Every structure is written in C-alpha cells, then in structure tokens.
Design a protein around this nucleic acid. Structure first.
Ligand SMILES: [Mg+2]
Ligand SMILES: [Mg+2]
Ligand SMILES: [Mg+2]
Ligand SMILES: [Mg+2]
Ligand SMILES: [Mg+2]
Ligand SMILES: [Mg+2]
Ligand SMILES: [Mg+2]
Ligand SMILES: [Mg+2]
Ligand SMILES: [Mg+2]
Ligand SMILES: [Mg+2]
Ligand SMILES: [Mg+2]
Ligand SMILES: [Mg+2]
Ligand SMILES: [Mg+2]
Ligand SMILES: [Mg+2]
Ligand SMILES: [Mg+2]
Ligand SMILES: [Mg+2]
Lengths: 93, 105, 150, 97, 192, 154, 67, 143, 47, 64
RNA sequence: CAGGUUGUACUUCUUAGAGGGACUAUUGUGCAAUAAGCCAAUGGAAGUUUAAGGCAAUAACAGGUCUGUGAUGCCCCUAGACGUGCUCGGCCGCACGCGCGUUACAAUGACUGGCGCAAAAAGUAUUUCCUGUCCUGGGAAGGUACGGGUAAUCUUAUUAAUACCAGUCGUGUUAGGGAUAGUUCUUUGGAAUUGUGGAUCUUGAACGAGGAAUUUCUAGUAAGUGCAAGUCAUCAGCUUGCGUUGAUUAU
C-alpha cells in the first residue's frame, strides 16, 4: 500500500482520510438532499471535510444540488467555490 | 509653370550642424517667390548603441562603457522648378551632413 | 434594436457559434484532428472534443475583427507559452495544419473570403456580406438574451 | 594651442637628449605663451633607471573633471622609442574661453 | 449614494471605538470607501503614507507575499473577496466589521528589544506603537493562513476567512496569529 | 458521475494488465500510465480507439476493456495509430514497428545495450561503465553516483 | 485574562535610544479609569507621532536616559 | 471650414495612453471600440465606473464618450481609460459650459481620487551593469 | 542613383570608421609636421 | 542637503551688491533681472543664484 | 460598429526642435546670535541636491594585461622552427572540493480551452538580412505561389508572458518536477557521432521548502514575468538592455 521513498519520517502520523470516488445508489439521493450537513457555507473543501468526497466528485454533487434549485452560488473561481444552501441550514436529523 | 515637388533629406551624426541646414534651407526657400515649402519635419532620432566592457584584459570588476551615436534625419518638401532648388542649396553646410534629393511632379 | 459582436464578450459568443456549426455540421472534422495532436507543442491532448468547432468558431470572430490577418500570425495570436524545462519559457507558434484548414472550411461556408486586391497580403481571409451577417445574428441573439436577464 | 602638435615637439626634444624638466618647461611655457589657459604634461616610463616612474609637470589652470573636461581640454599622447623600452608622453592643453 | 465594498458591504457599517486606531486605519475616510481594493496608490512614499491605505488594500498586499507564487495583486484581490463572502456566510456580519476587529486584536501591545552586552543577550520592556501594531496584526494574520494552507485542499480564501474570524474572537487556540500576539507579550512580560 | 450501483462488487479496485501492471482507481487514462510503456497522452489515445470513457473512473471497465488494451498494444498499428506515436520504430534493421510493452520494453533495452556491449561503440561503452552519454559534462554533474542511464520506478 | 490596560497618549517625543537605533522614548499622558493625567516617560518601538494613543500594560514603569 | 462640438482628453499611466473623445448625446461608453462591460480584468472594470458614479448618472446620460486605449498593461490601461473619462467630463464643461461647473467636478474628483486628473508620474527605472537587474547585483562571497 | 542603398545606420557607421582610417593613415605617415585633424566632406562626386 | 556652493552665494551676494535698488521680493522677477544682468551659463544655476539672492533680500528687510 | 476617401482643415494623442518650469517657493515650530541650515504643512508633473547615470583630485596598490595591438626593452625559436598551413584529437576528460546561476518541491497550483493589453531593440550587393500574404506537412519544417523594406514608410503600431473567465485533476514524490535514457523525424554545417539546435512516443531520478553560515535590497525599487540586443552557420541556462504584473518594513 505504501512504497513511497524517504517520505515517512519523524513528524505527523496523520492517516490520510480515505475519500472515495464512488457513491452507491442507496446513498445517492439521500446525500444530495442533505446539504445542511456540511456547515453553512459549501466549498470544494467543506464538502470533502464532512463527506470524504474529493473535490472533483464534490463539484458534481454541488452542481447537482445547484441544478436541483436547492443551492445558490456565491462566487466561483479556480478552486474557490462558494455555495449557500437556500432557505437556511435547518437540518439536524 | 513646370512645378516639381522636391524632397530634401538631411541626415547627420550630430544635431548642431543638421539644425543649421534645416533652419537656413527654409529661411532661404520661404524668401523666394517660386517657392512652396512643407515645414521642416523631424523624423524620429535613431540611436546606435554600443555597450563595451572597458578594460582590455578581463580583470577587475565589471566596467561597461555605453557609447552612443545619434543620427537626426530631417525632411523638407519643396514646390519649385529645377533651377530654384540649386539656388537654395547654395549654402556652406558643415561636413558629414548628407543631403539627398527627390524630384517628382 | 440590434447588436454586433463588439457588444458581446466573444468568450461567450464562441460558446454559441461553436454549436451553430454543430447542429448544422456544415463542416467535417478532418483526419489528423481526432487523431490526437494538441495544438503546437504542449502536454496533454485537448479535453473538450469539439475543440475543432470552437477553434474555427472563434477564428471567425477573429477574422471579423482583424481582416487580412494571416496563417502564421493567427498561429501566434492564439497565445502559447512553452515549459522547455530547465531553459526558461519561450513564446510558441501554433499549428498550421488545423489552422489553414479552418480558413478553407469557413470559405466554403461563404463566410471567409480571399481578397485578390491588396497587393500586400494577396489572398488573406476576410468577412463576407453573407458571412458577417450570420455573425451579427448570433451576436444579437446573445445580446438580446443578456438584456433578457431581467 | 594644439596639443597634438606640442607632443610631437616634445617627442622631438626627448629624442635629441634634452633633459626632462628642461624639456617640459619649454613646451609648457611655449603653450601658455600661445594663450593656453592651463597646461599639464605627463611622462610615464623608465625615467633614467630601473623601475618605472611617472613624471608630472603642471602650469596654471586645468580642468580635471566634468563634462566641460572634453570641451576646454585638448589631449594627445605619443610613444617615444628608446633603445631603453618606451616613453609615454601625454599633453593636456587647456584652451581659453 | 454610498459605494459598498465589492459591491455589497457598507463601510459606515463600522466605526473605530478605540481612539488608538482611529487615524491608523482606513474604514473612516470618504476617500477610503472604495469598490475595489486596487488603487495602485502611491503610499509608502512619505514616512507615514501607509496610513491612508484602505485597510484591505493592505491585506491584499501583505497577502501576495510569498516569492515565486506571489507578486500579482490581480489574484490576491480575489482570495480576499471570496474570503469576505465566506466570513459573511458564517457570522453574516459586515466582514469589514470583522476583519477590522481582528486587526485591533491580533496586534501585540508589548515586545522586547534585544540589547546584548558582550555576549549576554538581555531584553527590556517596550510598548508597541499603533502603526506598528496594525502592521504586525495583518502580517501575523496572513502569516498563519499559509501555514496550514500549504499541502491542503483548504484554500487561502478559506484559511484566511477562518482566521479573520477567530482573530476577532481572541480564540487563543484557533489563530496562529493571536498565539504569538499572546506569547510575544508573555515572553516580553518576562524579559521586562 | 460516480453513481455506482453495487459498490463492493460493481467495481474492481485493481485490474491486471501486462504482467505486473496493477491499476489504481481514480481515472482510466491516467491509471494506464503506470504501465511501463503508456503515458500521460498515450492513455488518452487508447480511449479514443476503444471508444472508452476517459472522464470516467478507473476499473469501471470489464476484462473486455482490459484485453482491448493488451492486444491494442500487441499490434497497435492494426487499430490504426500513425507510425509516429509509437515508442519503438524500425528495430534491428528489419522488425518494422512495435509499442514497447511493460515487459517487452525492459528486455528490448537489455538487448540493445547488449547490441552495443559487443559492438564497443563509445555510446555503447559509456552505458557499460555507467556514465551519461550525451550529457557530456562530468566535472560537477551527477556526483555521488546519482541515477545513471535507463530509469526504472520503484 | 484580566488585564489593567490603561490607555495613554503621547505628550512629547523625546529622542531615540537602544543603539539598535530604532527604539523611541516618549513622554505620555494618561486617560483611563484608574488614575489619569499622570505623566510617564515610556519606551516605544515602531512608528509613532505626537498625540497617538498607546495601551500600557503596566503603569508602574518609566525607565529613562538622555545622553 | 468646420467645427464639431467635441472635446479631446487624454489619460496616461506608465505608457498607458487614453484617447477620450466627448461629444453630446445619450450616454455612450466606448473603450477601444466596445462597451465597458467587456474590459479584460472584470475586476478593475469598477475602477472605471468610479468617476461615473462619483458624479452621477446625470452627466453621463447626456453625453456620448468614445475612448480608445492602447497603453501598456491590462491594469495600467484601465487607469488611463479612467483618467481620460475624468479629464474629459471636466474638459467638456470648460469650453462647452459655465467655467464654474468645471470647478465643481474637478474638486469633486480630486477629493475622491487624484489618479483621475493627475498623472501617475513614475515610469520604469533602467537597469545597471552593476548586476542582474535595476538595483540588484551579482552575489558577493566575502569570508 | 549611387550603387547600393544603405541603412543610414550602416552607412553612417561606415562613414565614421573610414574617418578613423584616415586618421591612422595620416598621423602615421605625416609624423613630421604638426598633424591635427581632418575635415572630410564626402560627395558622391568628390571626397 | 540643500546647501549653496560658494559660487552660488558669491553671485547672489554681488548681484544684490550692485543692483539692490532694482531687485524685488519676487524670485521670478529677480531671476529675470539676474539673467539680463549677467553671465549665468546654466539656466538652472541662474535660479539657484536668484532663489538664494532673493532670500538675502528678505534678510536685508531686516538689516543685519 | 467597422472600411474607403477627401480637405493648401487641425493638433489633444505620436514625433522632435525652440522656450518655458524648481530656486528648495508660501506658511509656522527647532536651530537661532545674525547664520548656515533642519522639520511639517499647502501649492505643485516634479521637492531624498527631483530620479537614474556619465565624468571622475593628489598619492598609490612592485593589482592586471607583453595572448588586442605594425606600442616596444631584454631573452628565447629559426626550416625534421615556438613562422606558417593540413588531417585528426583537446580544452566539456571523472572519486571528489569550491563559486556564479537555471528549474523545483505544487492548489496563492498544474493541464485544456478562450481572451485585439506592452517596450526596446535590430534587418540585404543577385535568392545571400527582417520577413508579411499563400501552398504543403501531425509536427519541427518545408515550397517558392504573390509581395514590402537597404526603413516612423516593409516585417508593425502589431505575435510577448505573468494576469483575467471557463473547464479537467483533487493531495495522491500522483507528476507537481522534470534530470537520465531509447528508437524515429527535422533543420545549420564539407563533417555533428564525445547527443549543435529543434519535433514525436515512451522512460520519469533527487526534491516534500533545505544545518553552520551567508548576498543583494527601500518604489514602479524587491519579486515574478516574458521581449530584445552581443556572441552567432548553428548553440543560451551568461551578459547588456526593455516592458507588463506589482507588495511587506523602514525613513
Ligand atoms: Mg491559475
Ligand atoms: Mg493558457
Ligand atoms: Mg603606469
Ligand atoms: Mg546625482
Ligand atoms: Mg581613477
Ligand atoms: Mg598589452
Ligand atoms: Mg612545425
Ligand atoms: Mg518559410
Ligand atoms: Mg522582429
Ligand atoms: Mg490529471
Ligand atoms: Mg518530454
Ligand atoms: Mg545519437
Ligand atoms: Mg537536449
Ligand atoms: Mg529574467
Ligand atoms: Mg540571429
Ligand atoms: Mg540571440
């Protein structure tokens, strides 16, 4: 699993959270409808923060929600995506 | 009236001298009756730059000589006959001052 | 009223004309094209597949503004820098194959024209009466849609 | 008033064995006389011996530095052949306004 | 009418309560009320011009400061705009009335002057000036952003945003900025 | 997107290609790059030939997709591919074309340096001794015997 | 963190000190709850004009020199 | 003989040159032959509108201002396109209105920003054989 | 029409060099009488 | 470092010395005089002499 | 909104020539003996002697060059010569030790696509120099089809790159990075093999921001970013200049 050279070394022993590139149909819908879960503001980062989903994937999940008149874009640049969950984050399971 | 448009070109290594020819060529042409002169026009001053490492043997710090040779080109246009020009070119213009002439109708 | 391309960010317009040539597929994506060969000398092959359309698409926008521009110039005018690696980046010229084709195709389309007058650039490409009209329509269509964004 | 000339005059005197100081004096006096506003002479070389040496003789004004340097100053320098080696002779005549 | 910042942030939404910072900041002026933080101004010319600089222009400047990567305000104006949007989406406050507070807090009030005599390194009690205080505050704030921002998917407009917030709070556990702000005073309070 | 249906099985984390070429799950073209023979842009070519989705993840391609590639490489020129996109071109004065495979490549070289070891050409001898050939400068260059010629990842 | 930050302003900029030739010595006047008016001669570091305002975290001080 | 009702104002910033023509009309804004909305740094676009707003849709609505700019860099040109507007609006009021109205607008702009009327003096500073750049130099090992 | 046209730059530099040629020529041979300089007026007719 | 070369001072001194009556309390007017009054090669230097010479004028409006 | 014209029309833009303009000016503290002057504010294109340079005193360093010199003293060589020429090697040889630098460790980023923003330089005797238009090649590069210029007229008022908008990648020594190496193709040159340079597909190393030390650097300055010019048949990682983007801290 790890063959990288002279990289291990005294310091941080921070296991890299295993983000995934696949989402099962059993969670597909359920998660798209639940934006209020990733904090108020939704950026490429936050999305990965709560869901273990790498940006590239996260975007589609954003554009998707953006499409489902569920989220509004604040600003969109190079890697800075600022999205606001319309109505207000009022979801606490 | 056999009118010939004459082009007076003056190119020179230094401004001192080329400005005298220009200044006086017009001074002299305006004063003739068969004359029509387009103001003395000054082309853009071309500068030849030569940067040289001073010292002959490459020792001691970096010393550079920035040498310049400026070339001013002035152009004057004339409405005259063929004798009229040779009448106004009768100056006493400094050395190294090239004067070229073009005749059209 | 009415609007010309000068009234529409073409980055936006090309995104429009690129398609008008798609639905109409008046063209015919040459061989070497799809045959993967990014323009100039770069890294990866283009990503968007219709780059062929986009290139021409804008090439029209370019010619509609700078009439008489040439192959080797547009070749430059597209804008490209090269990471030679250790040696710094030098400015780079584009590709003359895809480029010269696009002009020929736009000519068959009755949009481009080869001027046989100006003795400097004899045969350079220029917009045509019919050709440029087609453009203003796309433009005005976009123009009106922008004003439509109440 | 011409330095290019005076150097030759000096170049001549030196090859005719006229001692240095006596030499330079004649040219310098003669130069000032002609209307110079300041004159100087330099003579680097094996001045009567082993090592090299640089002799300087100056009279009146002189413009060491400035842009006017090249305007009010004339400078010519010559090589003088000896069965010794070489003599350097520089002449700085400073012209009158 | 009043020219809001980035088009959506009233300047008069803030006021400098403390007298210290009143002249050593920009929110307050008519000339300061700018839409864009880009002025290509001519500050840094006399020996106190820096003052008249619209506080955020200063932030942007101090922000494009790492070598190779930086030297281009163009972008930096962005990283700062997004960061303001992001700070708003969290406390929905006039993000200037946030960044501003942070500037007032993150500035150490005390420092130690290294005065060594024949090998021995002694120090004394020194009170930190206002201009110096603000400068330190911003320098500090930004300084930290890059800290985490490195090999992180977290972005400067995010790192910075997250910083300006806690920097206003005085949250000594969430602001590389205020950490020193405290330590510098502490260590300084020791050397004094 | 990445709207997978049967997680753990409707996907294959690791695919086997040309011997030891194990593949990573991320993006298909790029995944291919691990193969000692394919690279950044060659992967992209492959997908246009096999009409396979590029943007799509890696491993969402059956064994059919896998063989399409093993033989695509065996006689690439057959599927098309202009002679000038190949790794190897005109070998040993006869063998027309090929496309240096993960394992093929490794030995092809072992044979060419052998081709030269016997010949004893300068460039050849150079490889033997173990020194850059073209890079000429030896004064400052690669000291403490850095990476010589022919490089293999590990 | 309960500090006694008495705000004081600059009365007169004395001179420069600390051969580090960067420190500044200044005469202050106070404006705070505790006392007020009391004048001190404190040592600053950094940009400072006449009349600024500085938060002293210790009114019991006032080192000094002028030679 | 002729005599159009026009004003010719210019702006400049480190080589950036702004040709601004002002004629009376209905509020046109041409920059190199296009609407302001299309300048390159969508950002700085605001900078150019600063003069417009600072004065009021009034003065802009009555006239047609056409500008052409071929300065040096994206940022600089914008500064000139800016400076031309400001100089022109004022320049118009000088010969075509009460000299008093000019004074109003001049101080009006001056008060907000000088870069609309003044000229950003500084240019570039020439290199020196003393080193690699304008004021930097070849390293210097001492020891 | 004097033979070949030449960059007023190119032809001028040629002019100067020629003058400096003359200077070495004269000074080196006229090493008897006070030599000074040379006012050279060149015409496609008479140098 | 705005100090005056001796020459600059001598000039202003001697100018004022000869033309006091004529000299004004205005630099520009005086500069014109100084130029019409003598040989000042550098246009710039002329000013310096006048700018300073004018200064002296205001110090004589004192007497010492 | 582009294009063509035309007028003894105009100069704001451009050119360059005359002449303006700052001198430390006006105002108040410090100086204060009167002072020279120093400070701050205002006006100002411009106030650190405005900015950047050129020039550079007396002595001297037995500094460096006799391999730049038809500048030389002395001493060397002299025809199987240290003269001159020719063929082929070498100055780049590698265990290593130093010194300028180039590229980078990446999301303030890389890659794909889009986008009329620049300056300064250069340029031919016939094709031999700059090269525009056009044709052919995937491409470097070819052809000679149509052409201007020995230059504010022609390559050009434009072919920079950073920047900006969109898209892909998404922390993963992944390829960020590109060294090393392998066929192919192309240009310079009689000749390139001890890779001239350039294109293609692969190969894909150290590097994860660097110890003791240590160098320049206060404003359109540092930095980054490209462009020229010298050298030059071909070769820049050097040099000398040029412009764009453009700040922290001091005073
Ligand atoms: Mg980017
Ligand atoms: Mg790009
Ligand atoms: Mg000597
Ligand atoms: Mg100076
Ligand atoms: Mg000296
Ligand atoms: Mg010698
Ligand atoms: Mg021999
Ligand atoms: Mg060709
Ligand atoms: Mg060119
Ligand atoms: Mg990728
Ligand atoms: Mg490569
Ligand atoms: Mg080879
Ligand atoms: Mg190579
Ligand atoms: Mg550089
Ligand atoms: Mg060349
Ligand atoms: Mg070159």
């Amino acid at each position: 699993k790890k063959g990288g050279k002279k990289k291990w070394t005294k310091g941080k022993a921070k296991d890299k959270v295993n983000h995934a590139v696949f989402i099962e149909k059993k969670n597909v819908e359920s998660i798209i409808n639940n934006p209020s879960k990733v904090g108020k503001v939704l950026t490429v980062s936050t999305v990965v923060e709560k869901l273990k989903v790498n940006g590239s994937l996260a975007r589609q999940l954003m554009r998707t929600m953006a499409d489902r008149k569920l989220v509004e874009k604040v600003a969109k640049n190079g890697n800075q995506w600022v999205y606001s969950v319309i109505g207000g984050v009022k979801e606490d399971k | 009236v056999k009118k010939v448009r004459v082009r007076i070109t003056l190119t020179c290594k230094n401004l001192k001298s080329v400005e005298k020819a220009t200044s006086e060529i017009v001074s002299r042409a305006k004063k003739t009756e068969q004359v029509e002169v387009k103001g003395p026009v000054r082309m853009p001053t071309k500068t030849l730059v030569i940067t040289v490492r001073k010292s002959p043997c490459g020792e001691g710090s970096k010393t550079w000589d920035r040498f310049e040779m400026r070339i001013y080109k002035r152009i004057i246009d004339l409405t005259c006959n063929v004798p009229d020009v040779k009448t106004i070119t009768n100056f006493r213009i400094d050395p190294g001052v090239e004067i070229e002439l073009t005749m059209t109708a | 009223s009415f609007f010309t391309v000068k009234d529409v960010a073409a980055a936006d317009f090309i995104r429009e004309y690129a398609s008008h040539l798609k639905k109409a597929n008046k063209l015919s994506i040459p061989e070497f094209t799809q045959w993967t060969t990014t323009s100039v000398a770069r890294e990866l092959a283009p990503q968007d597949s219709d780059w062929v359309y986009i290139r021409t698409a804008a090439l029209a926008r370019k010619v509609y503004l700078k009439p008489h521009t040439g192959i080797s110039t547009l070749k430059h005018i597209f804008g490209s820098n090269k990471d030679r690696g250790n040696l710094r980046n030098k400015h780079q010229a584009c590709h003359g194959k895809i480029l010269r084709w696009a002009l020929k195709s736009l000519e068959d389309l009755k949009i481009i024209r080869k001027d046989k007058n100006s003795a400097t650039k004899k045969f350079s490409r220029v917009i045509t009466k019919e050709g440029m009209t087609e453009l203003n329509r796309i433009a005005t269509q976009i123009a009106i849609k922008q004003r439509q964004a109440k | 008033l011409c330095a290019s000339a005076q150097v030759e005059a000096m170049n001549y005197k030196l090859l005719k064995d006229v001692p240095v100081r006596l030499a330079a004096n004649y040219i310098i006096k003669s130069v000032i006389q002609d209307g110079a506003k300041g004159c100087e002479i330099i003579i680097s070389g094996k001045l009567k011996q082993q090592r090299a040496k640089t002799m300087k003789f100056k009279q009146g004004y002189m413009i060491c530095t400035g842009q006017p340097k090249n305007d009010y100053i004339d400078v010519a320098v010559r090589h003088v052949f000896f069965k010794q080696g070489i003599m350097g002779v520089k002449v700085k005549i400073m012209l009158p306004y | 009418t009043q020219p809001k910042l980035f088009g959506k942030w009233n300047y008069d939404e803030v006021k400098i309560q403390d007298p210290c910072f009143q002249n050593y900041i920009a929110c307050t002026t008519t000339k300061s009320q700018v839409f864009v933080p880009h002025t290509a101004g001519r500050y840094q010319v006399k020996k106190f011009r820096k003052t008249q600089c619209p506080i955020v222009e200063r932030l942007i400047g101090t922000l494009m400061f790492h070598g190779r990567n930086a030297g281009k305000k163009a972008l930096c104006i962005k990283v700062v705009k997004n960061a303001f949007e992001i700070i708003h989406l969290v406390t929905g406050r006039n993000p200037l009335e946030v960044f501003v507070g942070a500037v007032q807090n993150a500035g150490p009030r005390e420092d130690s002057t290294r005065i060594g005599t024949a090998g021995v390194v002694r120090k004394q009690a020194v009170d930190v000036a206002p201009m110096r205080r603000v400068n330190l505050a911003i320098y500090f704030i930004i300084k930290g952003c890059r800290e985490s921002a490195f090999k992180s998917m977290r972005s400067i407009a995010e790192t910075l945003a997250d910083e300006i917030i806690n920097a206003e709070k005085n949250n000594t556990q969430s602001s590389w900025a205020i950490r020193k702000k405290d330590e510098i005073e502490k260590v300084a309070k020791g050397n004094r | 997107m990445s709207f997978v249906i049967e997680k753990e099985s409707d996907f294959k984390y690791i695919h086997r290609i040309l011997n030891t070429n194990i593949d990573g799950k991320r993006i298909t073209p790029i995944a291919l790059t691990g193969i000692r023979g394919i690279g950044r842009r060659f992967a992209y070519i492959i997908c246009k030939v096999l009409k396979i989705d590029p943007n799509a993840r890696a491993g969402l391609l059956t064994e059919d997709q896998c063989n399409k590639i093993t033989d695509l490489i065996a006689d690439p020129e057959a599927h098309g591919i202009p002679t000038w996109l190949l790794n190897r071109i005109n070998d040993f004065k006869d063998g027309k074309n090929y496309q240096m495979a993960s394992n093929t490549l490794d030995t092809k070289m072992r044979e060419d340096l052998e081709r030269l070891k016997k010949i004893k050409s300068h460039r050849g001898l150079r490889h033997f001794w173990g020194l850059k050939v073209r890079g000429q400068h030896t004064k400052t260059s690669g000291r403490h015997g850095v990476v010589c010629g022919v490089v293999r990842k590990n | 963190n309960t500090e006694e930050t008495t705000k004081a302003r600059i009365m007169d900029v004395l001179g420069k000190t600390g051969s580090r030739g960067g420190i500044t010595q200044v005469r202050v006047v106070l404006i705070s709850g505790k006392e007020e008016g009391r004048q001190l001669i404190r040592n600053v570091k950094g940009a400072c004009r006449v009349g600024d305002v500085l938060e002293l975290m210790e009114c019991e001080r006032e080192a000094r020199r002028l030679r | 003989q002729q005599k159009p009702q026009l004003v010719q104002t210019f702006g400049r910033k480190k080589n950036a040159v702004a040709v601004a023509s002002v004629r009376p009309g209905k509020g046109l804004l041409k920059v190199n032959g296009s609407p302001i909305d299309m300048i390159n740094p969508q950002i700085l676009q605001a900078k150019i509108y600063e003069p417009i707003l600072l004065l009021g849709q009034q003065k802009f609505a009555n006239l047609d201002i056409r500008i052409r700019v071929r300065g040096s860099g994206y940022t600089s040109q914008v500064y000139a396109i800016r400076q031309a507007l400001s100089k022109g609006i004022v320049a118009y009021h000088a010969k075509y209105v009460d000299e008093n109205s000019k004074r109003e607008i001049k101080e009006q702009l001056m008060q907000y920003d000088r870069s609309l009327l003044v000229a950003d003096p500084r240019r570039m500073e020439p290199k020196k054989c003393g080193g690699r750049g304008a004021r930097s130099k070849m390293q210097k090992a001492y020891r | 029409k004097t033979t070949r046209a030449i960059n007023k730059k190119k032809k001028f530099v040629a002019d100067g060099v020629f003058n400096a040629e003359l200077h070495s020529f004269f000074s080196k041979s006229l090493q008897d009488a006070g030599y000074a300089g040379i006012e050279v007026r060149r015409t496609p007719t008479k140098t | 470092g705005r100090v005056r070369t001796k020459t600059v001072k001598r000039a202003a001194k001697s100018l004022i010395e000869h033309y006091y009556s004529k000299l004004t309390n205005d630099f520009h007017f005086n500069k014109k005089i100084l130029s019409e009054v003598a040989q000042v090669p550098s246009k710039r230097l002329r000013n310096k002499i006048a700018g300073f010479a004018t200064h002296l004028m205001k110090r004589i409006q004192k007497g010492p």
